A paper describes a structure:
SidN (Lpg1083) is one of the L. pneumophila T4SS effectors and does not exhibit sequence homology with any functionally annotated proteins. SidN, a hypothetical protein with unknown functions, is translocated into host cells in a Dot/Icm-dependent manner. Our results show that SidN is a nucleus-localized effector, and its structure adopts a novel fold. When ectopically expressed in mammalian cells, SidN is transported by Importin-13 into the nucleus, where it attaches to Lamin-B2 and interferes with structural integrity of the nuclear envelope architecture, leading to nuclear membrane disruption and eventually cell death.
In order to obtain clues about its function, we determined the crystal structure of SidN at 2.1 Å resolution by using the single-wavelength anomalous diffraction method. The SidN molecule forms a nearly cylindrical shape with a length of ∼60 Å and a diameter of ∼35 Å. The architecture folds into two domains. The smaller N-terminal paw-like domain (SidN1–82) is exclusively α-helical and formed by four helices (α1–α4). The larger C-terminal domain (SidN83–227) is composed of six α-helices (α5–α10), one 310 helix (η1), and a four-stranded anti-parallel β-sheet spatially arranged in the order β1/β2/β4/β3 from left to right when facing the sheet. Three anti-parallel helices (α5, α10, and α8) are packed against the β-sheet and the rest helices (α6, α7, α9, and η1). The two domains are connected by a very short loop. The C-terminal domain contacts the paw-like domain via the N-terminus of α6, as well as the loop between β2 and α6. However, the surface of SidN has a hydrophobic concave region lined with conserved residues on the end of the paw-like domain, suggesting that this region may serve as a binding hub. A single-amino acid change of phenylalanine (Phe19) or mutation of both phenylalanine (Phe19) and valine (Val40) in the center of the region to charged polar residues significantly decreased the punctate distribution of SidN at the ER and nuclear envelope, indicating that this conserved hydrophobic patch in the paw-like domain of SidN is essential for subcellular localization.
Author numbering:
A (entry chain A), B (entry chain A): 1 to 225
The structure:
C-alpha cells in the first residue's frame, strides 16, 4: 500500500489510544461513517508525519479523494478535534513565508499569495475582513489577490506588531533598497506607482518586497485582534 | 471510560497497523459505518484481551449494545476477517467443557449445553446436522437441547476420534461408575432409561456423565468431516 508505508513515523500507541477514546465516546456503533472519516483524518494528522510537507494535490492523491472533498474533510475535522487561535494560524502563515513555502508575488496593483490550507485561508480572510472596512480582494482557487494601493490607503495607518504604522514599515523597506537599486519615489497608496514604477525593479527586489509587504500586513492584522 | 481501561493488555502497534491497512484498503472514506463497526470489533478481539473470558451479557454491556446486535456483529466480523475450520471450533468447544467454562447437564432424555458463542453454535449445529440424518434437537436462546435416546439409536454406531463407536464409549463410562456406584443396567438408546434409571445417580456422577457424553458426541462429529 503506497499509503501505510508512506508513513515514515507514527506514534502507534497514541493513535490506538486516541482512536478508542473517540470511537467509543458514545458507545460502540454510535459514530456515523462521516464522523469516523473526520476522526481518521485527524488521527493521521495528529499522530503521524504522513501529511507533513505535502500539498493538497499530494494528500488528495494519497487519500484517493478529490481536492474539493479533502478541503471539506480538513476543515470539518480541524473544527471538531483541534483548537487554534487566529493568532497562531496567522503566525504559521507568516513563518511559511519566511521559509519560502509560500512565496507572495506582486503583479500590477495586486499582491498574490497561494494559501493551500483551508484553515489558514479561513482565519486570514476572517481576520483581514474584521478591521472595520471592506477589503479589496479575491480568491482564484487558493490564490489570494489583494489590491495594494487601496489596502495601504485604507489600512496604512494601523500599527504592526513592532509598533510602527503599516505604511511606515513598507516605505522603510523601499528606502533601504534604494541604497543599492536605482532610486524611485515611493507612493504606495498610488495604483499607477505599483503598475509602472514598482514594476521597474529587479525581479529579486520585487520578490523580497512582496514577502516583506505580506509579513507586515499579517503583522498588522495580528495587532488588531 | 469503563471501556478503554478495562483493557489490561493490547498490542497497540498492530492495532494501529491493522486498522490503517483495512480502513484504507479501497481508499479513504470507502468503508460504510457498518463495515467499520465490524472492523473495530475484530481489531479489539484480535489485538487486545478486552473480550477475554467475558460472557455475551458482559461484552454487550461493555459495548453499550443489545445482546442481539452483539451476536450479529460477532458473526459478521468473524466471517469477514477470520478463518477457522469447523474442526478447530469443535475442538475449542470440547476444551471449554474440560475447563468447566461450559457445563453440560442431563434432564430427562435430553442433554443441554449453553453455547454463548454464535460462531461455535453455528459450526456445531451445521456439523451435527450434516451426518445424513435429521437430528432431534432445539435451541432455547443459546442452550442446545439434544435428545439422548434418539441420538444414540440413530448415530451410536459412528466412530469417535479414538476409533471406538460412540455408543461403546458412553457405555464404557457407565460401567466404570458402576464400580463405585450402585449397579444399573445400561440401555442408552432407551428413553425411559434416561428418565428413570439415569436420574437415580448421584448429582456428581450425572454431572461427569454429561461432560463425557458431550465430549464423545463432539468427538464423533469431528471424526465425520
Amino acid at each position: 500500500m503506497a499509503l501505510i508505508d508512506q508513513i515514515t513515523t507514527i506514534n502507534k500507541n497514541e493513535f490506538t489510544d486516541d482512536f478508542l477514546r473517540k470511537y467509543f465516546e458514545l458507545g460502540f456503533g454510535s459514530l456515523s461513517k462521516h464522523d469516523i472519516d473526520l476522526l481518521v483524518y485527524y488521527l493521521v494528522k495528529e499522530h503521524s508525519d504522513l501529511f507533513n510537507g505535502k500539498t493538497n494535490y499530494e494528500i488528495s492523491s494519497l487519500l484517493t479523494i478529490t481536492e474539493r472533498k479533502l478541503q471539506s474533510i480538513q476543515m470539518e475535522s480541524y473544527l471538531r478535534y483541534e483548537n487554534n487561535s487566529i493568532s497562531k494560524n496567522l503566525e504559521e502563515l507568516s513563518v511559511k513565508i519566511t521559509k519560502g513555502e509560500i512565496k507572495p508575488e506582486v503583479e500590477g496593483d495586486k499582491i498574490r499569495v497561494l494559501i493551500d490550507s483551508p484553515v489558514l485561508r479561513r482565519d486570514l480572510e476572517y481576520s483581514i475582513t474584521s478591521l472595520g472596512h471592506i477589503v479589496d480582494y479575491s480568491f482564484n482557487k487558493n490564490i489570494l489577490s489583494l489590491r495594494l494601493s487601496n489596502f495601504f490607503e485604507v489600512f496604512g495607518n494601523l500599527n504592526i506588531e513592532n509598533g510602527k504604522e503599516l505604511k511606515t514599515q513598507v516605505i522603510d523597506f523601499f528606502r533601504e533598497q534604494n541604497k543599492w537599486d536605482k532610486e524611485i519615489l515611493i507612493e504606495i497608496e498610488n495604483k499607477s506607482w505599483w503598475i509602472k514604477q514598482f514594476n521597474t525593479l529587479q525581479a529579486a527586489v520585487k520578490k523580497e518586497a512582496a514577502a516583506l509587504i505580506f509579513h507586515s500586513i499579517i503583522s498588522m492584522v495580528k495587532s488588531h485582534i
